[PDB]
Design a protein around this nucleic acid. Structure first.
Lengths: 116, 341, 124, 421, 225
RNA sequence: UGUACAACGGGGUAUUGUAAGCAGUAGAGUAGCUGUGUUACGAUCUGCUGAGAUUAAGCCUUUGUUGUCUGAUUUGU
RNA sequence: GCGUCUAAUACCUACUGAUGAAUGUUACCGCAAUAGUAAUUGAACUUAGUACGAGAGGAACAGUUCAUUCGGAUAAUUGGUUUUUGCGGCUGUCUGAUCA
RNA sequence: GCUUGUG
């Protein structure tokens, strides 16, 4: 099983959900619920839609770049199985979830300061 | 249409009684021939398909399964049957004297108006020095050749706006009927867990009333739906437990998310008690009582002997085009919002 | 041969996905399968070239559909579809007549036709 | 297929064909009619029955004609073979009779269809239908002898050898069963007896073998002394594009003298001497050497008691007919013994293991313990691949111990300052 | 060493399996006899692993590589990659390659020392192949066919080039690879030798339909004996 | 007359998509005061604002507010 | 029994549906005389390149895996489908002006 | 108390 961010909305694409498009350019475009796929069919730019993650990241509504983003890179070269490595990765992911939540909360607080 | 299922009249009652029971033997331990449950929505399942000779051997297969609530069932009585030229005849019935309020309500159409005298006199009679019950048990044991145990579902443990319990007879598949009544003595007022009867990878058949529609237009008008239907070769994928976490977890996913979809099931509540997961669909809509049985026959085929390898269970919100599996994941992906602060 | 979503109508014209000199295929037969008949990805169908060199015109030849363009449920759950209908021409034994196949090639079709996969440069 | 004719359908005996056709037309066509039926309805009923019977007869005759090949147009060699096995004129007569019977049946059916339309009574139409059916039956019965002849010739044509005269081949010839029968029995899988009596073989036995990966076929001549067998052998020697291997006997085998063999060879010499002849022999030998004087014949003494030498003769005949940075090999490969399919000590292949467990059917093989690891004790792992909605493969990598420490240090460098406020 | 085999009554051996001087890969088809066919001629000398690419039985033509390492297309799932790594010795490198196309086996024709790829292949793909596999990369085509990987086959002892390859092209390829090259057919006149058969420095596998002349030509060109 | 139920409200899940209004240096274009030269009008843009609205008439939950719990008839070995 | 390029294309009664007096009342459970009855055809690895066969060609059962047709069911994912006339925008456009 | 295959 694999999970990929929607090409349009960047939302997670769980197995058996959404739809995929194979244009003549021969690359996989993963899509979330129909709404965004139909929006893509209209050639709408996700970087300009107010309600999509791409615009928010580009517009700076949420933290555009963070150190935590580099830890979620899909490794290309395979790695030999190791139970200790699996457990350490699970612990690291558990800690990274909390760290990312804290950083996102801090960024949101630093963005809502304009309400004062 | 199929002439076999004609006539297409409506079912006699919401609950479809078991037409036949699995063959009986006098060597195996006593066990329940069938169990009662309630249809609870549907969900997707993805797992590796270990099947010799198949094109997708050792591959991943995505398929849909239904979820049926199966709260622990409690025994309330036993019915004995003697053999006669005119078929089986019920000679006597017994009760445990501790009938719950739910089963008492089943005998009344207007509970609040009633004085609630369901088993007061019977309860007093049972409270004698065993003469009024031991004699009946001995008579049942002496003559009865097959023993059926009366049980009902704990409706109070189900998120349904119905206090009325469902009472149906359950047959025993063996046990040297002397030992059948001995086991019944040891199970009066007790509850039988789902895991103590059924198990994963076991092939079972389901009998229930399918979705009804009403008047509908053999080139003639008539009733459509709401008929008893039996579906066989239904594989049990996951056996749920209502006394532990990780109900929806797997050795692969190993997440602490419950099987209940985000926001709850559509037109149904939340599954917290014991539940059963079977591939395909059962002929019955949501909030519908269903019964399970072991196919009435010994299934030695590969589809039966094969062992499931559940990898991941979908729990996204069936309410609309749900995408997030757990509230924590949604919060992490979406982040804090004006609602939080 | 696992079931896939059909939808190709009889008489449909699909682009020729090989450099054999043809550009379209006129499907007139659903040979190899048992009501309104229809073709599907990976199915061998006899067709006649409508647009192309005169040599290939008016003669029925076998063809294999490499693209359907209609949404179908893959056995792995993920739904996918192509941009347009396409097919390739080959002999009844599966030997690809075209030297090379162009455009996307269905994974399900390539798996069931090893010769097509060999001559197919773009799987999926 | 020009080299075989086993596809011919079996011919139906005189009575069998008529009975089969009558039953077929009776079963398919309607059967119940009444005198009160409309005249047009009875007309259509009888016309349909007669037409169906006629079409059945025509189809049977056409199938018989199509199956049986035209002797003239098959091949000169096959034509001569058939003319030796049968009579060309008689066979053509039978074919013409079949064609004429089919044409007469067609004409009678058409005429009766054109005639029955003017009947008045039901019995008149019934009598006309009986007339057509009886005419067809009489026409069929007139072919009682040719039908049997066709059946007999079909029963034999289907078992004739399918030789290809165009491809390279070798012919063995000589006096009846001088020993060439043993030569054929040892040069090819073909099993032929070598009994001492003259005509041990009564047909052109054929066998195939491969030399230098080139396909070769050999034909065993029954014998040469006129007779039909002798004519067939002569035609096979002449028409076939094959060399002829004459057989002789230095011993008393077959009870024939060398002089008789020499005389026969000289008598038949003119029509095969130019085909690259070879002579095999199983103080009169001086006269036998006179054959060496012929430019195109060579002789080599031998015997059937040492039939292991047939390979040398085969090789000679085939040659005469035709003339007319270091690699990376692991040391393990160069050390492991080659697998022996029958050695009791041979390693048990995965095929045997699967068969013992139940084969590729009821039993499914497992890949556990097959993959290498640092430790084999913990081989049993599930590889969750997912955790809290995040793919493990996006985090499964070495050195994570230092990355986690660095991340914790970075978090500590901000928690103390309360930057998250 | 030359052996005749068929995978589930299929003649295309080079499609259902990938074989090299250091490892061998076969499909996961229900017919295990295909694995036993390779085991008989190889045994435990080199690892033989059941594997697939995106669940396909065409792993042979979906992947390309040499003794130094193996390459897989983007369609290969991470689970398949980790299974291959676990089942493949660490001495052999594994590296996923991303391209518009997916058929790496048809697009890359290479041996233990040289590689021939699609002229318009990804720019970084040539560097990745040179690094992981340690072989030269040449943007060239043989027999006027774009799919060099399937049409042609290369090894260290020799190479069976397309039967229609010109004499000049054969001479140039032999001078570049420093190994003999001869044009011929396989699998009873099958022009796509690479898909029909696989070959290494010490073993050759061909379809059952392969006629005796084709087997002799394969033995001679690769100098097995 | 109590895990009783109804109507609202809150929370959970979803559809759509950034609201009425406020302030601004971001500001087409017109006027004045000849080089954001300056200031009024002012198409739009920016932050509040993944904000606002809907949310069961056949979704889930309920601790919060609040109301109800008695109207006639029939049935006998 | 089942189909008929594929293995092959030789004005009232009846009706399905739904009420309904009855026997001491009501209610729960169960048996079944009875009327109907269903699955269907092919391919795919085996066994096989074995038996057979000079060759060309090429068996079958036990077991396993798939698809067509016909029937009973489900919206778990996708499409259809919208008086949720839900949301946002827009056209003519009125409440004097702007929201609504 | 008609009808069905051999001029």
């Amino acid at each position: 099983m694999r999970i990929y961010q929607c090409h349009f909305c960047s939302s997670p694409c769980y197995p058996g959900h959404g739809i995929m498009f194979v244009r003549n350019d021969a690359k996989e475009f993963r899509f979330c619920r129909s709404k965004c796929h139909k929006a893509f069919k209209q050639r709408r730019n996700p970087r300009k839609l107010k309600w999509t993650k791409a615009f928010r990241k580009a517009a700076g509504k949420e933290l555009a770049v963070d150190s935590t983003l580099t830890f979620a890179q899909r490794r290309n070269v395979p790695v030999r199985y190791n139970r200790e490595l699996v457990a350490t990765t699970l612990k690291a992911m558990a800690r990274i979830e909390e760290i990312r939540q804290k950083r996102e909360r801090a960024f949101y607080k630093n963005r809502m300061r304009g309400n004062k | 249409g199929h002439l076999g299922f004609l006539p297409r009249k409506r079912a006699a009652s919401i609950r479809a009684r078991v037409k036949a029971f699995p063959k009986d033997d006098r060597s195996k331990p006593v066990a329940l021939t069938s169990f009662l449950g309630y249809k609870a929505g549907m969900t997707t399942i993805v797992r590796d398909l270990d099947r010799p000779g198949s094109k997708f051997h050792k591959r991943e297969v995505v398929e849909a399964v239904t979820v049926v609530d199966t709260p622990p069932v409690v025994v309330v009585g036993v019915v004995g049957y003697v053999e006669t030229p005119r078929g089986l005849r019920s000679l006597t019935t017994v009760w445990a004297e501790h009938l719950s309020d739910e089963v008492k309500r089943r005998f009344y159409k207007n509970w609040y108006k009633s004085k609630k005298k369901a088993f007061t006199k019977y309860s007093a009679k049972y409270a004698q020095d065993g003469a009024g019950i031991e004699r009946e048990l001995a008579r049942i044991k002496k003559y009865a050749s097959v023993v059926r145990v009366l049980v009902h579902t704990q409706i109070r443990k189900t998120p349904l706006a119905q206090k009325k319990a469902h009472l149906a007879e359950i047959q025993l598949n063996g046990g040297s009927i002397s030992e059948k009544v001995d086991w019944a003595r040891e199970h009066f007022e007790k509850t039988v867990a789902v895991d103590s009867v059924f198990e994963q990878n076991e092939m079972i058949d389901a009998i229930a009333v399918t979705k009804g529609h009403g008047f509908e237009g053999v080139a003639r008008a008539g009733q459509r739906g709401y008929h008893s239907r039996t579906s066989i070769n239904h594989k049990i994928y996951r056996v749920g437990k209502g006394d532990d976490e990780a109900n929806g977890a797997t050795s692969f996913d190993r997440t602490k998310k419950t099987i209940t979809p985000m926001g709850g099931f559509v037109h149904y509540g939340e599954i917290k008690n014991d539940f059963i997961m079977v591939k395909g669909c059962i002929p019955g809509n949501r909030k519908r009582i269903v019964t399970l049985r072991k196919s009435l026959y010994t299934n030695t085929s590969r589809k039966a002997l094969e062992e499931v390898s559940l990898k991941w269970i979908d729990t996204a919100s069936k309410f609309g085009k749900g995408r997030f599996q757990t509230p924590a994941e949604k919060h992490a992906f979406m982040g804090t919002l004006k609602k939080d602060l | 041969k696992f079931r896939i979503s059909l939808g190709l109508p009889v008489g449909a014209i699909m682009n020729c996905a090989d450099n054999s000199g043809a550009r379209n295929l006129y499907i007139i037969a659903v040979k190899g399968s048992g009501r309104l008949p229809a073709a599907s990805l990976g199915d061998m169908v006899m067709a006649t070239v409508k647009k192309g060199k005169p040599e290939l015109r008016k003669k029925v030849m076998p063809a294999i559909v490499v693209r359907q363009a209609k949404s179908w449920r893959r056995r792995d759950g993920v739904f996918l579809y192509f941009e347009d209908n396409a097919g390739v021409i080959a002999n009844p034994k599966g030997e690809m007549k075209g030297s090379a196949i162009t455009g996307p090639v269905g994974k399900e079709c390539a798996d069931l036709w090893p010769r097509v996969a060999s001559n197919s440069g773009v799987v999926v | 297929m020009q080299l075989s004719w086993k596809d011919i359908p079996t011919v139906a005996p005189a009575n069998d064909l008529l009975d089969i056709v009558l039953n077929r037309t009776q079963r398919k066509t309607p059967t119940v009619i009444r005198p009160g039926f409309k005249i047009t309805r009875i007309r259509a009923f009888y016309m349909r029955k007669v037409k169906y019977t006629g079409e059945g007869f025509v189809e049977k005759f056409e199938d018989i004609l199509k199956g049986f090949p035209n002797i003239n147009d098959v091949h000169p060699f096959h034509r001569d073979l058939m003319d030796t096995l049968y009579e060309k004129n008689h066979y053509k007569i039978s074919l013409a009779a079949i064609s004429r019977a089919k044409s007469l049946v067609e004409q009678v059916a058409r005429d009766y269809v054109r005639l029955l339309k003017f009947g008045q009574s039901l019995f008149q139409c019934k009598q006309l239908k009986r007339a057509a059916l009886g005419r067809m039956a009489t026409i069929v019965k007139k072919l009682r002898d040719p039908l049997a002849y066709l059946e007999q010739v079909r029963q034999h044509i289907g078992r004739l050898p399918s030789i290809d005269p165009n491809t390279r081949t070798l012919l063995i010839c000589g006096y009846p069963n001088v020993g060439k029968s043993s030569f054929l029995r040892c040069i090819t899988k073909s099993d032929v007896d070598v009994q001492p009596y003259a005509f041990t073989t009564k047909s052109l036995y054929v066998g195939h073998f491969d030399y230098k990966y080139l396909r070769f076929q050999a034909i065993d001549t029954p014998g040469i002394l006129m007779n039909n067998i002798e004519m067939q052998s002569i035609y096979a020697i002449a028409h076939l594009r094959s060399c002829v291997l004459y057989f002789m006997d230095l011993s008393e085998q077959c009870g024939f003298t060398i002089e008789a063999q020499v005389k026969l060879f000289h008598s038949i010499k003119p029509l095969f001497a130019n085909k690259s002849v070879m002579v095999v022999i199983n103080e009169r030998a001086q006269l036998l050497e006179s054959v060496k004087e012929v430019p195109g014949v060579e002789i080599m003494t031998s015997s059937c008691q040492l039939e292991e030498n047939v390979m040398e003769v085969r090789n000679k005949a085939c040659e005469k007919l035709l003339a007319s940075r270091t690699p990376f090999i692991p040391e393990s490969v160069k050390n492991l013994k080659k697998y022996d399919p029958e050695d009791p000590n041979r390693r048990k292949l995965a095929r045997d293991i699967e068969a013992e467990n139940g084969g590729a059917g009821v039993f499914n093989v497992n890949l556990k313990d097959k993959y290498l690891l640092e430790d084999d004790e913990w081989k049993n792992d599930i590889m969750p691949e997912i955790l809290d909605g995040k793919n493990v493969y996006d985090f499964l990598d070495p050195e994570i111990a230092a990355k986690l420490q660095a991340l914790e240090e970075e978090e500590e460098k901000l928690e103390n300052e309360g930057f998250y406020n | 060493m030359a052996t005749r085999t068929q995978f589930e009554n299929s003649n295309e051996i080079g499609v259902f399996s990938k074989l090299t001087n250091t490892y061998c890969l076969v499909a996961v088809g229900g017919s295990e006899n295909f694995y036993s066919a390779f085991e008989a001629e190889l045994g435990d000398a080199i690892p033989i692993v059941h594997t697939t690419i995106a669940g396909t039985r065409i792993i042979g033509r979906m992947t390309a590589g040499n003794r130094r390492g193996l390459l897989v297309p983007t369609q290969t799932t991470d689970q398949e990659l980790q299974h291959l790594r676990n089942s493949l010795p660490d001495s052999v490198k594994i590296q996923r390659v991303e391209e518009r196309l997916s058929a790496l086996g048809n697009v890359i024709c290479c041996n233990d020392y040289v590689a021939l790829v699609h002229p318009d292949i990804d720019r970084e793909t040539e560097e990745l192949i040179s690094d992981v596999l340690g072989v030269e990369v040449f943007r060239q085509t043989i027999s006027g066919n774009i799919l060099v990987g399937s049409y042609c086959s290369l090894s260290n002892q020799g190479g069976l080039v397309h039967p229609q390859t010109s004499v000049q092209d054969q001479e140039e390829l032999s001078s570049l690879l420093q190994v003999p090259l001869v044009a011929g057919t396989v699998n009873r006149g099958s022009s796509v030798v690479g898909a029909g058969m696989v070959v290494n420095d010490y073993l050759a596998v061909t379809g059952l339909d392969t006629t005796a002349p084709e087997l002799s030509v394969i033995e001679s060109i690769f100098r097995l004996q």
